[PDB]
Amino acid sequence: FANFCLMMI
Amino acid sequence: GTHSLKYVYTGVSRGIDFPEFTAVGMVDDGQFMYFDSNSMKAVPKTEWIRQNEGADYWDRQTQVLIGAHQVFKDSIQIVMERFNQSKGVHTWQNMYGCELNDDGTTQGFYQYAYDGEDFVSLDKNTLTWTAANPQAVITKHKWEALAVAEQNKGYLENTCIEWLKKYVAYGKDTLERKVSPQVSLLQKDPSSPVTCHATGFYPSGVTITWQKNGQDHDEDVDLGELLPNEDGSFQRMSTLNVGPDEWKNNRFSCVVEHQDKTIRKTEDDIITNFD
Amino acid sequence: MKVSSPKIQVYSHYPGEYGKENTLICYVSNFHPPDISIELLKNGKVIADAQQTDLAFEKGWQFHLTKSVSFKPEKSDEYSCRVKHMSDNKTIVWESNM
């Protein structure tokens, strides 16, 4: 299952 | 055995042929999931995931990746500006994943690239981001303030491994399969080189050797690369270039070893077209 | 930004024995950027119903794709893989090794 949490660079 | 779960995201700005965002998920480097920003839907790619997860799982995966697409759009815009590139096609990539070894030890990685070159990489020991260039340093500081390394480490060591364990159970028979190579000796012309061809095997590790008169022969040997078949199996070949005379005067053979078992082919086995 | 031109390898699943059902495979690897055209050809004509893998990449970030289709090689027929990356146009003829 993919990581739910992403932050823009 | 060791198993792995990996995700690879591709973001493209300004392209036509490919979507803005593509995501592929893999267990043991075999794809089980696909998503793109054209369909906006995450979909199964193996029988074992189809049989074991359904609508709820895929709706959740779809939602995560719609979010990833949005973030990728925003991210690529930022990095392009930092390299002073307001025109042309550019790419933003993320790969991350975890491995579970037999001892129950685990490994994991989290990496990003801009135009196919390292941008930032997670060091999950120091909870810091390695910046490959000055352009990445701004991101390093931002992410360290937002505790991104901590979140990512949490995911890799817990969530990722928990799901990997589930996937391994779902696909156990497929993932643990041992399929022996089908081996042939090939020759185009009686005076031409002889090719030992091995195909249809899994896992991918294979040893192809040549012997002369029962002893290992390492001269005039050309070992080919490991190559993928269309069905998840693999193939590899080795070519021996001694003369038809050297073949006539001696007893050459090919030995293919896979999973501690060997197959041997000799001159009596050589096949050809036209004949 | 730098272009990485594709490695192109054309082969069959099984030994390319004439008159035998087989699979023609074109493995296109080590390339960047990702936009690419891959076509399998029989006597210079595009073969229909060829299957292409979903876009992925390895460690080092370079992309790879596999195009494949069922085929039955015969004496008078030529098979090839035509790859178009950026403005390049390459065609690699299938060698049977037999």
The two three-digit tokens of residue C24, written as one number = 């023609």
The two three-digit tokens of residue B174, written as one number = 């497929």
With beta carbons under 8 A apart, name residues in chain A contacting B65: 2
Domain that holds residue C85: 1-98
Residue pair C24/C79 in contact by the 8 Å Cβ criterion: yes
Domain count, chain C: 1
Give the amino acid at B106.
T
Q: What angle do CA B23, B26, B32 make, to 5 degrees?
A: 85
Question: Longest Cα pair distance anywhere in chain B, in angstroms?
Answer: 73
Pairing of strands B207-212, B30-36: unpaired
C-alpha distances in angstroms, B33 versus B45, B65, B143, B260?
A: 5, 11, 28, 32
Question: What is chain A's Cα-based Rg?
Answer: 7
Task: Name every residue whose Cβ is closer than 8 Å to that of residue C53 and which is 6 or more positions away in sequence.
Answer: B31, C65, C66, C67
Is it true that the peptide bond before C6 is cis, omega within 30 degrees of 0?
Answer: no
Question: Which candidate, B71, B156, B147, places its Cα nearest to that of B111?
Answer: B156
Cβ count near B275 (within 10 Å): 7
Q: Closest partner residue to B75 among A3, A4, A8, by Cβ?
A: A8
Same topology between domain B1-177 and domain B178-265: no
CATH of the domain at C85: 2.60.40.10
Buried b (16+ CB within 10 A) or exposed e, B205-223: ebebbbbbeeeebeeebee
Task: Give the chain C residue whose CA is nearest to the CA of B116.
Answer: C61
Residue pair C70/C23 in contact by the 8 Å Cβ criterion: yes
Q: What angle do CA B144, B150, B155 make, to 5 degrees?
A: 140
Segments making up each domain of chain B, as ranges: 1-177, 178-265
User: In whole angstroms, what is the distance from residue B217 CA to residue B33 CA?
Assistant: 44
The matching CATH number, chosen from 3.40.50.1100, 2.60.120.260, 3.40.50.1820, 2.60.40.10, for B178-265 is 2.60.40.10
With beta carbons under 8 A apart, name residues in chain B contacting C11: 227, 235
DSSP B102: T
Question: Which candidate, B224, B225, B207, B217, places its Cα nearest to that of B250?
Answer: B217
Experimental method: X-ray
Residues of B in CB contact (< 8 Å) with A are 7, 23, 25, 57, 60-61, 64-65, 67-68, 71, 74-75, 78-79, 96, 112, 119-120, 139, 142-143, 146, 148, 151-152, 155, 159-160, 163
CATH class for domain B1-177?
A: alpha beta
Buried b (16+ CB within 10 A) or exposed e, C51-88: ebbbbbbeeebbbbbbbbbebebeeeeebbbbbebeee
Pairing of strands C56-57, B106-114: unpaired
Cβ count near B274 (within 10 Å): 8
